[PDB]
Write a protein that binds this DNA or RNA. Structure first.
Ligand SMILES: [K+]
Ligand SMILES: [K+]
Ligand SMILES: [K+]
Ligand SMILES: [Mg+2]
Ligand SMILES: [Mg+2]
Ligand SMILES: [Mg+2]
Ligand SMILES: [Mg+2]
Ligand SMILES: [Mg+2]
Ligand SMILES: [Mg+2]
Ligand SMILES: [Mg+2]
Ligand SMILES: [Mg+2]
Ligand SMILES: [Mg+2]
Ligand SMILES: [Mg+2]
Ligand SMILES: [Mg+2]
Ligand SMILES: [Mg+2]
Ligand SMILES: [Mg+2]
Ligand SMILES: [Mg+2]
Ligand SMILES: [Mg+2]
Ligand SMILES: [Mg+2]
Ligand SMILES: [Mg+2]
Ligand SMILES: [Mg+2]
Ligand SMILES: [Mg+2]
Ligand SMILES: [Mg+2]
Ligand SMILES: [Mg+2]
Ligand SMILES: [Mg+2]
Ligand SMILES: [Mg+2]
Length: 484
RNA sequence: AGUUGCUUUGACUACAAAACCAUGCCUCUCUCUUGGAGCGAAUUGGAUGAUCGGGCCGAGGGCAGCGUAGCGCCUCUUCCCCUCACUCUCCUUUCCCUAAUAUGACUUGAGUCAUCAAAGCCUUUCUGACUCAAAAAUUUUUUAAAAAAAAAAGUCGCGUAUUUUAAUAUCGCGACUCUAAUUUUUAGUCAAGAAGGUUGAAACUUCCAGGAAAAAACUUCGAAUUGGGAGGGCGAUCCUCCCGGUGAACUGACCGUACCCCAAACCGACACAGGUGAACAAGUAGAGUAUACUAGGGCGCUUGAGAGAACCAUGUCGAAGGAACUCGGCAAAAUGACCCCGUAACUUCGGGAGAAGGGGUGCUCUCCUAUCUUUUGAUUAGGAAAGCGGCACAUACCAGGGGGUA
RNA sequence: CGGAACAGGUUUUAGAACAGAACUUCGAUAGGCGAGAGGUGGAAGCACCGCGAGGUGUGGAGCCAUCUCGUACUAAACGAA
């Protein structure tokens, strides 16, 4: 067409790619490794792409959390002659701050031309400040925008209110609503969502009703499914059931595009509301809308059925998932493992655990966490320490360190007190050294009573000075000084 | 010396949505590319009930030709096909509406902005995935010992009976497809990155005239400083092996650096039209670094105002004639480019030769070919063919006079 | 002839400077403006024909080195010098 002359179907195959770049980079899947491999293969080739094609590929990569390939594509395409606009510079500033850190984003903003330091790049840097939970730099940049007569849109106000709600100072949001209404900046739907979230955060349920009433009477913001999802979440957490039913029915009515996330919200909010038939109806609607249902929807649905005490239905849906899964996700298997171990059916959970790695899903720290929770609840410590070692050695899936919960360690040390197991207590302390460094409160401050079986260790109050000093209770040094 | 490389390559699409609550274990575990559940219609469907009409088969008595069984004729309604209603739970074809199909909704009018080491090779080095390899795990076979090996699911089909009814299961089989698992470790490969160096900066071919030196630098080897370990030692800090041995959040002294440098600053007595290495040097026309014009950068040349005689210098043009000029065609004029045709005497067979002599050349349209067209259903180059304008189409600039004979 | 002749200014049929000749405001000396002659040869704009290069009409069109005529608008006595 004349309005869109750079057609991606009719373009020459000698100069350009045979397929769109946002299809080419996701040819082998949406994983980070495959996308980086496809980007490396594309950048070594001789076929070219459009500017809007690169922009669409960057926006598609941003929506899936692939910030490094988006930043690499933007930088290499800019180095090859694709000149950035101010909007592209704001997008690139956000990409730099997402992939390399906020200091690199500030360095990119400083090195920008002075004519490129406009409302778009200022708003992008403000959003990057608000996402990183830095209130001082966000307030300083907002005051700098107000000083230089740079217009603060509703998006920047929304980012500031989200920062206030996430930090804990949610009382400042209703002041910011009137501040926004003072400068004739009109709210969007997210403004009302974060406003009702902040009003529910200050233990004011009745404030949500005037927000939705004035949104209806505003006449310039059309409600969507996220507004009713926010209302339904507020009503479910507040204990109100009928208003949650009305909000979820409105969410179903407003979900005209059959969004996957809205279906997850519907399934989980009916799951927390306890209505099983509504859960099954939403599941049938989702399976109608998504003929090849992904692992995330099964992971939510089977967990909801387990929570609502429908174990044969959860088993049937798990068997249906097992026969159609392209990737054997371990989280769906962990749902059934937790369901079996919480009900004492350890044989089925052990069968699932011993048959899962051949099916394609290696065990993570959550599987061993469920098993050690079962062993702690049953009272067996030797089998629990093995699962603790397995979960510590596996670690978290995002690269972090896995540690047992405080209550579980407290219960396990209480179990070691009764059987006078000094060796098991020392092994648990060794694992807690291997996991963290502080480990001081109730972990071994009153747990010197485990030593009251046969003798005591050498250092005689010099051991408790090594782990950055721990102070024991006043009733614990009596038997400690008795054995010196 | 000649080739092949070094020789730049792209974008122009207008776009802050990147700000989120449920669950959470890295919650899209990897979603690139799926039409609608419209209270929307028309031919069709049907989960339904009767009436009328038509048509087999069939039923008995018979008129019928046998000792059983007949061929035409005569009374009947089931069963099926239709029709009027009830009707949305299944199928077929199309239309409307809504969704999606990449954002938003004149100045490349011959430009602007980027880029200007890409691609390789060699050392390391962090992290992933796969592969063994190998051992420890269990079964079979062979003689407690040795050899070979599967483990988990989905789909199709066959023969056979167990519930207080989740029998879509349990019993044995034949076939197909998919996955690699408990622990330990090596060696490897790929993948994704981070530090160094190094090549590109030259390679090949041919030729004769046969194309620097240097314990400088570099690679190697030896010995090794003020170091750290492991075994001998009736010893004296001795002997033999191993690692390190120029390493860095050490330090890198001294001298030049202004300014001119085709020039008014250097060599010429001058602020002198002379002389003064190499490197870089955008665009259009062009074979070109020729030549014309040109931005950028630099400069207007350190005497001017008038007048527009002779004469002198340097240029433009010139009737008719065309070397009669003169020592002599001196000077000038002329020729001049590319493509095509054509090219003599003579010759040492290499030449002569661009011999000489001729023709065409602009623009527009349309075909044909190709350009080894990185926007291939329209652009450049070449050729045909038909037209258009002028005195003139190598239109300016640039750019052989030719022949005969001593 | 006797406040004559010069000089100055605008010029030119004259001219190296000088000299000559014309005119010097009750003035056409030069410039300008207007008209005509003369040269060139058919402007622009618009319309029509053609795919196009281009062609046709409006229309001896448009333009102006010179020459003549008209005309004090400017400079020559604007010399209340
Ligand atoms: K110099
Ligand atoms: K020139
Ligand atoms: K003169
Ligand atoms: Mg040496
Ligand atoms: Mg200098
Ligand atoms: Mg001299
Ligand atoms: Mg000099
Ligand atoms: Mg000079
Ligand atoms: Mg030349
Ligand atoms: Mg030149
Ligand atoms: Mg200039
Ligand atoms: Mg001078
Ligand atoms: Mg003269
Ligand atoms: Mg003549
Ligand atoms: Mg003549
Ligand atoms: Mg002649
Ligand atoms: Mg003569
Ligand atoms: Mg003579
Ligand atoms: Mg003579
Ligand atoms: Mg001559
Ligand atoms: Mg000449
Ligand atoms: Mg041509
Ligand atoms: Mg005179
Ligand atoms: Mg006059
Ligand atoms: Mg005439
Ligand atoms: Mg003209």
């Amino acid at each position: 067409h004349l309005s869109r002359p750079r057609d991606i179907v009719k373009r020459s195959t000698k100069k350009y790619l045979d397929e769109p770049l946002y299809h080419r980079l996701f040819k082998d899947g949406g994983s980070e490794v495959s996308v980086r491999q496809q980007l490396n293969q594309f950048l070594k080739g001789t076929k070219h792409v459009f500017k809007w094609e690169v922009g669409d590929t960057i926006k598609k990569l941003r929506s899936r959390g692939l910030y490094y390939p988006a930043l690499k594509l933007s930088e290499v395409m800019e180095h090859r002659g694709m000149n950035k606009t101010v909007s592209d510079q704001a997008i690139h500033l956000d990409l730099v701050a997402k992939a390399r850190g906020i200091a690199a984003g500030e360095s990119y903003f400083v090195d920008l031309p002075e004519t490129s330091k406009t409302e778009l790049t200022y708003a992008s840097l403000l959003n990057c400040y608000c996402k990183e939970l830095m209130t001082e730099k966000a307030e300083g940049l907002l005051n700098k925008m107000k000083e230089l007569n740079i217009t603060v849109s509703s998006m920047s106000y929304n980012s500031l209110m989200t920062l206030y709600t996430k930090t804990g100072q949610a009382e400042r949001v209703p002041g910011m609503i009137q501040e926004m209404k003072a400068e004739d900046v009109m709210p969007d739907s997210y403004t009302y969502n974060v406003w009702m979230r902040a009003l529910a955060a200050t233990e004011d349920v009745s404030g949500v009703e005037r927000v939705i009433e004035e949104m209806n009477r505003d006449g310039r913001v059309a409600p969507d499914w996220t507004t009713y999802s926010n209302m339904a979440s507020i009503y479910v957490d507040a204990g109100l059931s009928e208003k949650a039913e009305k909000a979820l029915q409105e969410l179903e009515m407003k979900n005209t595009d059959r969004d996957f996330k809205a279906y997850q919200f519907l399934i989980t909010l009916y799951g927390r509301l306890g209505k099983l038939n509504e859960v099954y109806r939403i599941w049938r609607s989702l399976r109608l809308a998504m003929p090849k249902t992904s692992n995330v929807a099964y992971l939510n649905m089977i967990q909801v059925l387990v929570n609502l005490k429908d174990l044969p239905g959860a088993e049937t849906l798990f068997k249906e998932w097992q026969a159609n899964c392209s990737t054997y996700d371990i989280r769906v298997v962990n749902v059934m493992i937790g369901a079996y171990t919480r009900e004492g059916l350890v044989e089925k959970a052990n069968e699932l655990k011993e048959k899962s790695p051949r099916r394609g899903g290696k065990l993570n720290a959550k599987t061993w966490e469920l098993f050690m929770d079962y062993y702690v609840k049953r009272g067996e410590t030797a089998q629990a320490l093995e699962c603790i070692t397995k979960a510590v050695s596996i670690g978290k899936g995002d690269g972090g360190k896995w540690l047992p919960s405080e209550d579980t360690v407290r219960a396990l040390m209480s179990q070691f007190e009764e059987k006078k197991d000094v060796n098991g207590a020392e092994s648990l302390l060794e694992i807690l050294k291997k996991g963290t460094d502080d480990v001081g409160a109730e972990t071994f401050e009153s747990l010197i009573r485990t030593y009251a079986a046969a003798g005591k260790s050498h250092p005689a109050m010099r051991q408790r000075l090594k782990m950055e000093k721990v102070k024991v209770d006043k009733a614990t040094e009596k038997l400690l000084d008795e054995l010196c």
